[PDB]
DNA sequence: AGACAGAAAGCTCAAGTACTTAAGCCTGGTCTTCACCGCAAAAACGCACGAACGCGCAGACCCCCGCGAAAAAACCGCCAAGGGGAAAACACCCAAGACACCAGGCACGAGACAGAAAAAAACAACGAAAACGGCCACCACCCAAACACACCAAACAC
C-alpha cells in the first residue's frame, strides 16, 4: 500500500474546479511536484537550522525557506497562506 | 630689690651604621634562555540493542521467439533559394593628449550591536490506548478516441 498525495490533490481540484477531472499521468505529475517542493523546502530549512546552531525546525525556518525559494508574488502569497493557517491553528 | 640656684636649650664629642672600590689585555670551551598547570577532543573498552545480514519460498514480470499488417525509412532526381565570396564606404571605435576628480591610504572617535553568560519555562518527545481516514477491490458511467462528411481557406499560379 505505497503512500501518495492523490486524495488531497483531488480534494483541492474539486474545490477549485468542481467539474474538472484528472488523468492518471497528470496525477503522477502532481505527486512528483508535491514531493519535489517538499524536499526543496525541507532541505533549505535544514540548512538554515544548521547555520544558526538550532536543533528544532519551526515555522520561522519554513517561512524563510519559502522566501528564499519561491520567486516574487508566489512567495508573498505562500507566506500569507502559511501565516493564516498557523494563526487559525494555534487559536483553536 | 637683688642675689642664689636650678632647670632650660644648646652644644659638643665619642660609638654605631651605610656605602664604596676592588690591574691590563687576550684566547678558548660549555651551557641556558618562562614548569607547572589542566581542559579539549581524539580515543579504549564494556554492554546492550537492533539493523542488516542469511536463506528459503512466491511469483511477478522481463526476456526470447513467432507471424502480419502497415508504415516509415531509404533511394533517386529536379531545382530553387540560400550560404558564401567579393567589393564600397562611411562613421564607429581605438588611440593619444591635457586637465581634473575622487579613490585610496592613514588617522582617530563614537558607539551600535554581536558574542557570551546565567536564568527560567514553555514546548517537543515518549508510551499508551483509540478510532476514524486512507488505502484496496470492484463496480458503473461517459470523454475522448475513432471513422465518416463536409465546408471552409490557405497556396501558388498567372
Swiss-Prot record:
Keywords on record: Acetylation, ADP-ribosylation, Antibiotic, Antimicrobial, Chromosome, DNA-binding, Glycoprotein, Hydroxylation, Isopeptide bond, Methylation, Nucleosome core, Nucleus, Phosphoprotein, Ubl conjugation
| Source species | Homo sapiens (Human)
Q: Which residues carry this modification: N6-(2-hydroxyisobutyryl)lysine?
A: 2, 11, 14, 25, 53, 76, 84, 88
Swiss-Prot/TrEMBL GO biological process terms? antibacterial humoral response; antimicrobial humoral immune response mediated by antimicrobial peptide; chromatin organization; defense response to Gram-negative bacterium; defense response to Gram-positive bacterium; innate immune response in mucosa; killing of cells of another organism; negative regulation of tumor necrosis factor-mediated signaling pathway
- Give the sites modified to Dimethylated arginine: 47
Explain the purpose of this protein: Core component of nucleosome. Nucleosomes wrap and compact DNA into chromatin, limiting DNA accessibility to the cellular machineries which require DNA as a template. Histones thereby play a central role in transcription regulation, DNA repair, DNA replication and chromosomal stability. DNA accessibility is regulated via a complex set of post-translational modifications of histones, also called histone code, and nucleosome remodeling.
The full protein's residues present here are 34 to 125 of 126
In the record, N6-methylated lysine modifications are located at 84
The protein's recorded glycosylation sites are: 80
The primary location reported for this protein is nucleus
Top-level taxon of origin:
Eukaryota
State its location(s): Nucleus; Chromosome
Kindly list the positions at which N6-crotonyllysine occurs in this protein: 2
Which of the residues bear the PTM N6-glutaryllysine? 2, 11, 14, 76, 84, 88
Q: Which residues carry this modification: PolyADP-ribosyl glutamic acid?
A: 3
Per UniProt, subunit arrangement is:
The nucleosome is a histone octamer containing two molecules each of H2A, H2B, H3 and H4 assembled in one H3-H4 heterotetramer and two H2A-H2B heterodimers. The octamer wraps approximately 147 bp of DNA. Heterodimer H2BC11 and H2AZ1 interacts with VPS72 (via N-terminal domain).
Q: Which residues carry this modification: N6-(beta-hydroxybutyryl)lysine?
A: 2, 53, 84, 88
In-chain residues carrying the UniProt-annotated modification N6-acetyllysine: 53
Which cysteine pairs make disulfide bonds?
none
- Protein name, as recorded: Histone H2B type 1-J
Q: Which residues carry this modification: Omega-N-methylarginine?
A: 54, 60
Q: Which GO terms describe its cellular component?
A: CENP-A containing nucleosome; cytosol; extracellular space; nucleoplasm; nucleosome; nucleus
